[PDB]
Symmetry: D2
Subunit: 331 residues, 4 copies
């Protein structure tokens, strides 16, 4: 069937640009704004710049290189014209329908599969491409979570570590660009930390990306946890894992294990580099995790690995990848 998107925001537009170049068909887009705003933001992105194609619109459609996309503005999933558009797969990027109770609503909209682009509650399955994607059974799995941007950077690295060396416990910190859940200047928020001026602060905040890695790598259940620090950058992040392994290693063995995963089984998902790169060098990179080899440290069995990831673009490519998988499998 066709793909439909609810929530045309940061992940939403990026997934669109990507699905668009791969030649996947997006038939309807629903946000809470007029088509004129939907088309301006798609044409101009502050981070990824000019859209490479022609964008136009009318009161009911988005026109991209001549193809037409229904763009609506229904604040409720139930009433979104899924079936009538030919949409079997609904990417759900609003950020407000992560309880699978609420995401279920696209189904009686006529949608066949919902893919929550964030961690879900009561979903059918959480998938992280590269790690447990073979776990997908189209007979029983309909409401799928693709996990968070962070859990997708942790999982591929943790998997290599657990298989080559065995992991006993682990803690991690992600130093992350700010996102739209934060304030620009001091302002009321559910979290007294995120309530602060995102661009002139380092903001410690909680995360469950670590705990959630246990969903795709059960062996870590109860042995992985972490924290997050938000910093004044717009997109782009880095995961700082500190693992306690089951044997003694040297940086070279750890790096060598990561590099081989990156050129074999985890190809396209996990990457590995030896250059002296900074944040800007990984922006718009499509990998879920980019191992910066020169930073690895090992104190015997307490090792420390670092993986960069573009929380927008990389995630976005993962959503795209999943959608193609839900599709090739009969959806």
């Amino acid at each position: 069937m066709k793909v439909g998107i609810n929530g045309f925001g940061r992940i939403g537009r990026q997934v669109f640009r990507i699905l668009h170049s791969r030649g996947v068909e997006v038939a309807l887009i629903n946000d809470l704004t007029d088509n004129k705003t939907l088309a301006h933001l798609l044409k101009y992105d502050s981070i990824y710049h000019r859209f490479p194609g022609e964008v136009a619109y009318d009161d009911q459609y988005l026109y991209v290189d001549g193809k037409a996309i229904r763009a609506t503005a229904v604040k409720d999933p139930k009433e979104i014209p899924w079936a009538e558009a030919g949409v079997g797969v609904v990417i759900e990027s609003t950020g407000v329908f992560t309880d699978a109770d609420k995401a279920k609503a696209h189904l009686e909209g006529g949608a066949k599969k919902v893919i929550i682009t964030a961690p879900a509650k009561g979903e059918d399955i959480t998938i992280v491409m590269g790690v447990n994607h073979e776990a997908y059974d189209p007979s029983r799995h309909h409401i799928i979570s693709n996990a968070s941007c962070t859990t997708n950077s942790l999982a591929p690295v943790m998997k290599v570590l657990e298989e080559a060396f065995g992991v006993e416990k682990a803690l991690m910190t992600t130093v992350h660009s700010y996102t739209n859940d934060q304030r620009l200047l001091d302002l009321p928020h559910k979290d007294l930390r995120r309530a602060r001026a995102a661009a002139i602060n380092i903001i410690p905040t909680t995360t469950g990306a670590a705990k959630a890695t246990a969903l795709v790598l059960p062996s870590l259940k109860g042995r992985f946890d972490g924290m997050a620090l938000r910093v004044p950058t717009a997109t782009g992040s880095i995961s700082d894992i500190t693992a306690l392994l089951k044997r003694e290693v040297t940086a070279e063995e750890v790096n060598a294990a990561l590099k081989a995963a990156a050129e074999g089984p985890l190809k396209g998902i996990l990457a590995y580099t030896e250059d002296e790169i900074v944040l800007q060098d990984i922006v718009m990179d499509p990998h879920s995790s980019i191992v910066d080899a020169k930073l690895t440290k090992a104190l015997g069995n307490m090792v420390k690995v670092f993986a960069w990831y573009d929380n927008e673009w990389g995630y976005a490519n993962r959503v795209a990848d999943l959608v193609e998988l839900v599709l090739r499998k009969g959806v």
Copy 2:
């Protein structure tokens, strides 16, 4: 009577800090959050830093320096206990009750005078201290307005220009720190320029600040206009004014007029300096507009003048000065 504050935000909290240090007694603050958050934001400020005094709170009041202050979470100004609390002067800084129509609600609640800290629609009077405050009339003016931050910075200067030389036409641009009406990252908004990422962009935006100056200095009616460029700083702004005067002058003469005013009549509102300062140097300056004398240029009768202003602190001192005026004349 006692001062209440509806809208505990950026301006709301600085005014409070200023009124608190002056001896005025605030008696109720209303916002949309809980007392914990309120107490917290008051105590810690990313820009003005720590609140100098003890702040605490129960599920009812905030205790600043032991003095309890009622605090509520009422979304409708009509349902606010101003009277019940002994609140004569309400400070409206939520920035949603700017049409004096809705603003009028605080009157039903028991208030006698409302002060909109923004450009209002349908107000009794619009005052800019130092310029036309001698025109406030207790018996007829109930819904005052202290104008915008930018308006407050131009007026003092324009007054000086007009009286000393006379203005024929004048256009201006204000380079201004971002504010809470902008976005962190590209997100929908009514103004498409402001839908964009605030901190990594120079954003042109429209401003009524020049036109609104004509309301306090009527001679400029239809003779003054401007633009605004929002830049990536969190507080502090500068006004670049290009005036076409009625006689040929030298920068020296223009500087001399502006200095004389700063030392005399406008003392306390207009400041003048010859030091080579920069943004951070005016952060937390209470003045309405500071003249950077070394930047004055003059081509005959065409002059260019600049004036920094701290859009949060400077402006908030004006609000306090007015609240304290409205009170010095019986509410």
Copy 3:
């Protein structure tokens, strides 16, 4: 003859990327560092991202896409092997040999022309592509200045305002991203303003960009001047020109002039747009000036135009255009 670049920094590398894609042959590059560093900085740029191609090096050469470019590290220009490399045209982008007398040293190295990529002093001719490029006389011009990034944005516009409406007086201000002549945090500088923290201030600094337009447009001699405000952005600027013209006009009228120039005689140099763009949308745009049509204001004869420019990319393209000109006309 071939091109050689002296000073491989922000402008030199961009000019290179461009000369490179245009097929011009750069034979020798000189800076103050090793090839590993020249190669790395070239390969990874924070603003324009990965170099689209292969970069390698050795103790003696930089290999860009398989081509060998002699790369050296000589502090004195008299000592650069221009002759030994076959370099006829040198690009002087160090920023330290702007007094033509010092830049003369290049000719005593075997070089036949020098193009100072900055306002010069003592130059044969200062050329602003599109405005007065026809005056370059190969027979008599050898040390050519391409003027500042700002002058190049003011001249294409002022030229149009002078021919269609006639300019009588003008003052401009340029809100500019910071450059390497500034400081990261407070440090001594010849300029007490530039001595301050570039990324957290708005820094007023002086500029001769206005008076310089008078070299390419003699009619502005004694009639145009300005200022600059450096702000927290990496690259990209905007010029705010306030002109006093000779006839009364309407904004639409002024835009129409600009737009026409933009699609005819100034094609490729000047650009005109009507979309509601912000800074990020003009990064890596190749024009010298991009008229932001919706910003024009007009109070009779006093007009106000705004033109964006990317001080790195735009300027670089102009340097590449001048080099190609110099070459097409016989060295």
Copy 4:
């Protein structure tokens, strides 16, 4: 005796303000620039703002509240009149004379003690106040190094972990504000990660701060190590310590330990808080390290702790303190 300061930069000037507010007499300041500049730089600070005193100057002295303070521009330590000023303790804060063999010239010039505000090479001793100042020996120790901002932040925490539970191994990352050894925009540098533009990048960098902790807590030799991440903030850093302890602990045990140290023996050096603060909240805080109580986590015997530190102010205070001890111990 009297204090002399070589290298009036970020640390030099903060140290002066501090020593000045304490009653310590600074007799001579040397740097490489003119007096006008030093004074202006002292008077106006982008981060801590205005110097709260009268600053004036003339061709040979600075004047802070009336006191004359000799000021000079001597490029070589050997040629400094340290003695002619009756200067006994020289604060070597330029950043180029951290090699004791080089800082030794201050002695030749007449001083008796040299305090290098940075990790040295060949120093008689390395002190980190609150941890090992009891080892300073006046008769033997003449060229003292006060360690790095980072070590001073790790040390007190490590001391408390080691004594309460015992540290097996531990690694750490410091998320740190940028500093003057980094670049504003891509420019050659020895470190290719630091050659990159500082204000728009998360720059990974090497630090020996974990290894110097062993110099003061010798039980850590070969059991401690780590990385640094520079971020687009101007001042303030946070340390993220992942320590493997000698027994199973709970977050409370650990914080209980740390709280107790702060209220007790480490008072004034270590601090403890349970508020949900962020970076700006610690700027200008005088403590070497501040435990963010709520950020602590523990997986059995693996713990993670976070401690903030204003790298200019916390440190300059430590520098002031050591100056005070070297004086009280007798020069």
